[PDB]
């Protein structure tokens, strides 16, 4: 496990999002947190009927690939990941539990280099080394509580650093599974 910034979240089940099909032309995907869980589940039922909110997260990413596929994935959390357009639309700014595709993974839709993401809590998914990457992120904000609907704490970025390669005949799509479990969640202001 990677404990983000060395702090365990302080003061509740696994959620499985849609699988993402990693291909030869894939550029990357990003999910906005906790907006990814607002629309779905009992957790998202509290988010839309409460004023304030605070919670950590336990993001777990898995890739199901054989021994004849190759590639590397960089999974990293970026607190306050603001999008920079070539204003963004709503669907691009806060995509639901379906992420969005990066059009410019080099600048990461924010004018910042992909090469320097390792300064953030991250793990490498190398298909010949491991298929799992789990990151424990605490609550990060300037205030103890914040609105879950109008503000995203961080954005989980999953970018193919090296393209997926395979021989013709093998499965051309590698599913990517993300399982996130809210940890030390709090709510207030029942509306």
């Amino acid at each position: 496990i990677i404990v983000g910034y060395g702090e365990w979240p302080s003061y509740n089940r696994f959620y499985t999002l849609d699988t993402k099909l990693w291909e030869k032309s894939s550029k990357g995907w990003y999910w906005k947190f906790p907006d990814v869980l607002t629309e779905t589940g009992v957790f998202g039922q509290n988010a839309q009927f409460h004023y304030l909110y605070r919670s950590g997260f336990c993001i777990h990413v898995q890739c199901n690939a054989s021994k004849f596929h190759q590639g590397a994935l960089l999974v990293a959390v970026l607190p306050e990941y603001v999008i920079g357009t070539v204003h963004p639309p709503y669907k691009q700014t806060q995509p639901g539990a379906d992420g969005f595709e990066l059009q410019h993974p080099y600048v990461l839709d924010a004018g910042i280099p992909i090469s320097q993401l390792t300064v953030c809590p991250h793990q490498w998914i190398n298909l010949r080394t491991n298929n799992c990457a789990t990151i424990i992120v605490p609550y990060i904000n300037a205030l103890p509580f914040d609105s879950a609907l109008n503000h995203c704490n961080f954005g989980l970025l999953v970018v193919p650093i090296s393209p997926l390669d395979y021989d013709q005949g093998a499965t051309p799509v590698i599913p990517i599974t993300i399982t996130l479990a809210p940890m030390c969640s709090e709510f207030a202001g029942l509306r």
């Binding site: 607190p79 306050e80 990941y81 603001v82 204003h87 700014t93 280099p113 090469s115 300037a142 109008n150």
Partner: protein, 200 residues
């Protein structure tokens, strides 16, 4: 190690904004006024610092004239002056400084103004997207003391130095050219590599 501390990294007062009075002007406090300092502050996500401001006023030719000036600081939430005789000038809750151009430059200190616990440079949400609401430090308004029109043209330079800098959540440094002061968008068609290239 003592060289690379945050205080040393963010010391060395830099020119933030120049004011021309060829009879008053408002200058909203903005650290980004220093041209090369935005890319330095964006390297973290949160900040908490106190600022020292220095006002060096002179004519466009740099010559020093015997004129009285008033710089008033309106804290966040206060209304701005709309003319040279507005009632906002005499308000006691907007601190002022009266200094002649002969005296050494005025030097005032402004503490941490944000209602939050840190200045945040990226808002991943709405209060219009990306509008960090509680990052407003205040405003500095400059006018020449007097009712009639002043006899000299003035240029006012502002130098700001942060003390007691604290930072959080480091992030990758900007590599693309900046386009707008508020949102971080770039030029997609004219996208460039981080550095130089070679042939092999």
């Amino acid at each position: 190690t003592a060289e690379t501390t945050l205080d040393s990294f963010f010391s060395r007062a830099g020119l933030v904004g120049e004011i021309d009075l060829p009879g008053y002007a408002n200058w909203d406090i903005d650290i980004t006024g220093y041209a090369q300092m935005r890319r330095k502050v964006e390297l973290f996500t949160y900040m908490r610092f106190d600022a020292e401001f220095t006002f060096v006023a002179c004519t466009p030719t740099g010559e020093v004239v015997p004129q009285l000036l008033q710089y008033m600081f309106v804290p966040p939430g206060a209304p701005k002056p709309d003319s040279r005789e507005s009632l906002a000038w005499q308000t006691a809750t907007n601190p002022s400084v009266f200094v002649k151009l002969s005296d050494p430059p005025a030097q005032v200190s402004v503490p941490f103004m944000s209602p939050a616990s840190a200045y945040q440079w990226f808002y991943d949400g709405y209060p219009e997207y990306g509008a960090m609401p509680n990052n407003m430090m205040g405003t500095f308004s400059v006018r020449t003391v007097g009712t009639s029109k002043s006899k000299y043209p003035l240029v006012v330079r502002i130098y700001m130095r942060m003390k007691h800098v604290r930072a959080w959540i480091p992030r990758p440094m900007r590599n693309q050219n900046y386009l707008f002061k508020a949102n971080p968008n770039y030029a997609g068609n004219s996208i460039k590599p981080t550095g130089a290239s070679r042939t092999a």
